[PDB]
Ligand binder design. Structure first.
Ligand SMILES: [Ca+2]
Lengths: 95, 97
């Protein structure tokens, strides 16, 4: 039956979104975000091209966002909230 | 204002759940679980909610399917690890076998 891997976060960006050009020729947007009830820093990676351009065009340090993604751990360990190529959600709140 | 830190997982344990007693004297249950739709993802789960902890020890085993709802937490260690935590009074753990 089903299987699920879903992270939902509403919080504030720690710096401007940064953009790195991949092996693929694609642009991948990375930023860090804080959630609190002291504060949790989450490392977010945006491959979804549509949400990537939106991060670069509209997000900045201090921006509040809503993020849906997948939890992924890579072996050089680092766990990131990944918005994969055809999935995920990214929405600017408080705009 | 609004704030949210929530992770939802449906997957299979990679090992029987383990009980450790903390500094607090609190009994904490840990296990690793796997998800998949490059590779399968291993999530490190930490259950402080005593009710879901007892359920995990009594009813979960290597290979059991489970639904987990917790929050994402990364903690520094001296020589980082990110965990899905079911905190003392929150979280959700559901058997799906
Ligand atoms: Ca929107």
């Amino acid at each position: 039956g089903s299987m699920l891997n879903k992270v939902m976060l509403i919080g504030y960006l720690g710096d401007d979104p940064e953009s790195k050009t991949m092996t693929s020729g694609a642009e991948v947007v990375n930023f860090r975000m804080a959630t609190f009830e002291k504060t949790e820093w989450h490392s977010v990676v945006v491959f979804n091209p549509h949400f990537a351009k939106i991060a670069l065009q509209y997000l900045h340090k201090g921006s509040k966002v809503y993020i849906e993604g997948k939890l992924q751990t890579r072996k050089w360990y680092t766990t990131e909230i990944v918005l994969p190529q055809y999935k995920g959600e990214l929405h600017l709140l408080d705009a």
